[PDB]
Design an enzyme around this catalytic site. Structure first.
Site, mmCIF file in Angstrom:
data_model
loop_
_atom_site.group_PDB
_atom_site.id
_atom_site.type_symbol
_atom_site.label_atom_id
_atom_site.label_comp_id
_atom_site.label_asym_id
_atom_site.label_seq_id
_atom_site.Cartn_x
_atom_site.Cartn_y
_atom_site.Cartn_z
ATOM 1 N N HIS A 41 43.828 50.159 32.953
ATOM 2 C CA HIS A 41 45.103 50.061 33.433
ATOM 3 C C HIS A 41 46.256 49.908 32.671
ATOM 4 O O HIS A 41 46.150 49.638 31.043
ATOM 5 C CB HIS A 41 45.249 48.938 34.394
ATOM 6 C CG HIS A 41 45.329 47.687 33.661
ATOM 7 N ND1 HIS A 41 46.000 46.891 34.342
ATOM 8 C CD2 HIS A 41 44.721 47.172 32.811
ATOM 9 C CE1 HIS A 41 45.915 45.540 33.560
ATOM 10 N NE2 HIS A 41 45.271 45.909 32.837
ATOM 11 N N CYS A 95 49.307 43.111 28.498
ATOM 12 C CA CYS A 95 48.100 42.650 28.862
ATOM 13 C C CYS A 95 47.111 42.893 27.560
ATOM 14 O O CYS A 95 47.393 43.975 26.892
ATOM 15 C CB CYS A 95 47.290 43.200 30.029
ATOM 16 S SG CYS A 95 45.992 42.632 30.731
ATOM 17 N N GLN A 113 42.205 41.200 41.551
ATOM 18 C CA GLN A 113 42.939 40.712 42.607
ATOM 19 C C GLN A 113 43.101 41.911 43.341
ATOM 20 O O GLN A 113 42.708 43.084 43.221
ATOM 21 C CB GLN A 113 44.715 40.844 41.831
ATOM 22 C CG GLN A 113 44.884 39.658 41.209
ATOM 23 C CD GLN A 113 46.163 39.662 40.268
ATOM 24 O OE1 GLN A 113 46.923 38.712 40.186
ATOM 25 N NE2 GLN A 113 46.391 40.788 39.688
ATOM 26 N N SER A 136 50.302 40.142 39.147
ATOM 27 C CA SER A 136 50.547 40.178 37.904
ATOM 28 C C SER A 136 51.783 40.971 37.408
ATOM 29 O O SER A 136 52.382 40.627 36.307
ATOM 30 C CB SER A 136 49.388 40.428 37.013
ATOM 31 O OG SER A 136 48.207 39.856 37.228
ATOM 32 N N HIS A 139 51.148 48.047 38.060
ATOM 33 C CA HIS A 139 49.902 48.676 37.494
ATOM 34 C C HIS A 139 50.037 50.199 37.609
ATOM 35 O O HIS A 139 50.339 50.594 38.650
ATOM 36 C CB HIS A 139 48.570 48.053 37.679
ATOM 37 C CG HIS A 139 48.239 46.673 37.653
ATOM 38 N ND1 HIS A 139 47.474 45.917 37.000
ATOM 39 C CD2 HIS A 139 48.944 45.677 38.659
ATOM 40 C CE1 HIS A 139 47.497 44.824 37.160
ATOM 41 N NE2 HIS A 139 48.163 44.520 38.063
#
Length: 145
Positions: A41, A95, A113, A136, A139
């Site tokens: 991702h 990330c 998630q 978060s 994505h």
């Protein structure tokens, strides 16, 4: 006749039939479970991300809308072949998985998630998501296995 998650749509600019998946946010022109999947991702955080910080930026202040514009740009570039998913993940993913070209390795249901998990499992092998929203951030998800 369509598999689950998929619906028919027509382009607003051309009229041409395409198909959209409301779990992965993917769209395509053509008419379209394992214990584990492996995905990569690219995450773009924003000011409402659970932790608005990354290796790229100590304080992330972009809006959710600016984050989505960035994601959509990256999707265009990946689809065009102008840039590779892996290259963009390594440069721009908010990330630490950026340092592995965005690879998360293999995972089961229960671990990520939920919107991420559902998109991941609904992708075909080798297929990329649209924008996927989580606490978060936003994505782009590539299912690699």
């Amino acid at each position: 006749k369509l598999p689950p998650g998929w619906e028919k749509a027509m382009s607003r600019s051309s009229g041409r039939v395409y198909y959209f998946n409301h779990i992965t946010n993917a769209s395509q022109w053509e008419r379209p479970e394992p214990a584990r999947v492996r995905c990569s991702h690219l995450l773009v955080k924003h000011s409402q991300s659970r932790r608005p910080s990354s290796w790229r930026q100590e304080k992330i202040t972009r809006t959710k809308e600016e984050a989505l514009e960035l994601i959509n740009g990256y999707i265009q570039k990946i689809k065009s072949g102008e840039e590779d998913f892996e290259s963009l993940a390594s440069q721009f993913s908010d990330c630490s998985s950026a340092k592995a070209r965005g690879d998360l390795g293999a995972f089961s249901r229960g671990q990520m998630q939920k919107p991420f998990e559902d998109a991941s499992f609904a992708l075909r092998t080798g297929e990329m998501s649209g924008p996927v929203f989580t606490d978060s951030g936003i994505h782009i998800i590539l299912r690699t296995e």
